[PDB]
Amino acid sequence: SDASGGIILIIAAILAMIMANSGATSGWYHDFLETPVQLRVGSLEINKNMLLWINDALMAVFFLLVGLEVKRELMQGSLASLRQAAFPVIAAIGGMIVPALLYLAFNYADPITREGWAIPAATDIAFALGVLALLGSRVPLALKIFLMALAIIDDLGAIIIIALFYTNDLSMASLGVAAVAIAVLAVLNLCGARRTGVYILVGVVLWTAVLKSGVHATLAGVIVGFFIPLKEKHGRSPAKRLEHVLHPWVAYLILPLFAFANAGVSLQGVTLDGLTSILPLGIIAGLLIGKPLGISLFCWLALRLKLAHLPEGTTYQQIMVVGILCGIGFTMSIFIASLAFGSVDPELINWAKLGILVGSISSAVIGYSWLRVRLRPSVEF
Amino acid sequence: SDASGGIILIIAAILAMIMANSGATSGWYHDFLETPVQLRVGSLEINKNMLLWINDALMAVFFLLVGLEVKRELMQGSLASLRQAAFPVIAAIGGMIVPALLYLAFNYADPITREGWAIPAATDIAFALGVLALLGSRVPLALKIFLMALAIIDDLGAIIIIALFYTNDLSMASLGVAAVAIAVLAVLNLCGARRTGVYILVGVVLWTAVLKSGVHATLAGVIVGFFIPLKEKHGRSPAKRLEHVLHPWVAYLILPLFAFANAGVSLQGVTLDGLTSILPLGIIAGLLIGKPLGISLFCWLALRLKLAHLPEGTTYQQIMVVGILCGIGFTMSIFIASLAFGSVDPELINWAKLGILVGSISSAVIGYSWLRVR
C-alpha cells in the first residue's frame, strides 16, 4: 500500500506548493510556518519556530521506526549475515561519496555552501517506493530490499556524520541527562521489560534532553528503536509489533504532513531563470548523476571484488535504474538542508529546495521511463 | 494486584511527606513543585506551575480510564440494567449530599470556604481498594463492584458540577475548537474507526483547547473515553483493550507520581494544634461522618423504597462499613480542593490537605478494624 502512501505524499507536497503559491493562502501558510514558539519554565527558555518543532517531532518518530527496522535487518534480515549485507553496504558508501563529490567539485571552496555536501547523499524512501509501487506486481522483492537498504544506510549515515559535526551547542547538563537516559534504556533492556511504553517514555526524556539539536533529537528516536527488545520470547515481539503499528502512521500521517509543511515554496513570488547557482546545479549533479553513477559503479566494483549481489535483479539493467531511483532525496534532502543551513541561512534552504525538487522529479520520471520497459510483463488473459 | 497498587501509592505519599518535611529535601521539593512553567507561541502565552501541568495531564489520563470504565458499566455492567444500577446510584447522591451538608453546616456562610463544599464528596478509589485488597480472598466481588460504582458516581459527579460552576474563564475560540474536536470524535465514532490512536489525538486537541481549565482538561479525558468504540465487532474491543493497557500505568505510575507530588506537606515547618478551623473540622465531619451516614442511610432508604441491593453483601453490617470506606477522599479530595481553591488561595489548600489526610487515614483505619471481624 506504499502506492497510496506515495500518492498521498505527492498530493500533500503538491498541495503544499499550491498553498505556498496561491496569493490567498501563501500568506497564512508562511505566517503559520514561521510563527514563533517558545517555552519558558521559570528561568528555562527554549524557542524555535513551528516548523522546527514539527520537524524535530516528525523526524524523531520516523527515525524511531528506522531504528526498529535497521535493528530487525541487523539481526534477522538482509543485514544479519555478513554475506548478503556486503552488497547494499558497498553500494551505499559509493552512492554517497559520488553525490557529494559531484556537488563539492561544483561547490569548490565556498565555506558557507560546502556544508551542504551531505544534501545529495539523501534519498526519499517514500517517493521511491511510491513510484515503484505504481508498477504493481511486476516488481521483484530483491529490488525493494536492495533499495530500502541503500536509502537507510545513506540517510542514517548522513544523520550520524551530521550528528558528529555540530556538537559545540549541546550543554553538559543536557548531555548528562542524555547519557543517563540512554543508560536507563540499557538497564531497561538488560533487565528485559516487555512493556515498550517505558522505553518510549525514557525515549522522550532523551529527546527533550537533546531537543536543542534537531540532528540529536532525531538520533534520539534511533537510539530508542535500537534499545527496544526484539526477541519473540514472549510469543510476540515488541519491536516488530510496534513497527507494525507505526508503519501506517508514518506513511499516512507523518510523511504527508511533513511534505505539506516543508515542500511549499513560492514560485509566483520569485522565479529567476538562472538556476546556475552553484547550489542548484551542484545538487542536481549530485542527485541526477552522483547517485546513479555512485551506486552503479560501486555495484560493478562490488561484483568484481569477490562480493556477489542480491539475487534475481539484473545487475546491468536494473541495478543502474535503482541507482537513478536513489537520486530522489526529496523529503530527506529537505531535512538535511534544513539541518546544515537552518541556523546559517533561510535562503539557501529555498534554493536547495529548488535543486532537490528538480533532481527528484527528474530522477523519478527518468527512472520511471527506463524501468517501464524492463519489467518482464506479467501477462493477463 | 490493587494491593501492591495501594502500598505503592501509600509509599509514594509517605515518601512525599518525608520529602516535604525533612529540611535537606523540603526546599528542592517546593522549588521544583512551584517552578514557573510558561509556553509562548508568537503572541500566545500560557503559564502555570509545574504542579498544575502535572495535575492536568495526570487527571486527563485518569479520567480517560474512568470514561472508559463508566461506559463499560453503562452498557455491559452493573450500570447497564436499570435494576442493578438503582442501588449504587441512590447510595451515591446520598453519599455526596450528607458529606457536603456536614461540612456546610460547619462552614455556614463563608463565601471563600463555601466553595470547597464538594471536597468531602470525593473518594480515593486506589486507597480504598488498596486497603480492601489487604484482606485477600475473603472479600466478595459484589462489595468491590458497589464501592467502585459509588466512587465513580460521586467523583465524576463533583467534577461535572465543578465543570458547570466556573465557565467565566473559557474563551470563545477555545470553546469553538473544543466543540469541533468533540464533533470530530462523534463523526469518528459514527463512521466507526477501529484505530483508537486517532480518537486519542483528537482527544489531545480537545485537551489542549480547554487546557486553561483543570476541570475541563480533566473532563476532556472523560469525553475521549466516552467516544471510543466499545463493540466487540472486530473480534476484539478497542475500549476494553485500551482500558486493559491503561490499568497498570495509572496504578503504578500515574497515581504514585501524583501522590508523590501533591501529598507532601510541611509539618515540622508549622503544626498549630488548633485543627478547629472550619475547614479541617468541617471536612473531617464531611468524610468520617458525612460519608458513612450518607451511604448507609440512603441504602436503608434504598431498600425500603422498593429498590433492592447488590447480592450477597450484608446490608446492616458490610454496607455501612463500605460507607466508612467512602470517607477516604485522599487523592480525589486533594484534586477537588486544588480545583476550588487553586486560583483563590495557596493556604486553604494545605489546611484542606490536613483535614482530608486526617479524615482519610482515620476512616481507613476505622473502616479496617470493623471489617477484619466481618
Could you characterize the architecture of this molecule?
Chain B: Keywords: Antiport, Cell inner membrane, Cell membrane, Ion transport, Membrane, Sodium, Sodium transport, Transmembrane, Transmembrane helix, Transport. Chain B: InterPro entries: Na/H_antiporter_dom_sf, NhaA. The structure is a homodimer. Chain A is 66% helix and 3% strand. The first copy, chain A, is mainly alpha-helical and 381 residues long. Chain A has a single domain (1-381), classed as Na+/H+ antiporter like domain (Na+/H+ antiporter like fold). The two termini of chain A are 25 Å apart. The relative contact order of chain A is 0.17. The interface between A and B is medium-sized, with 12 and 12 residues. Strand 1 (36-41) of chain A pairs antiparallel with strand 1 of chain B.
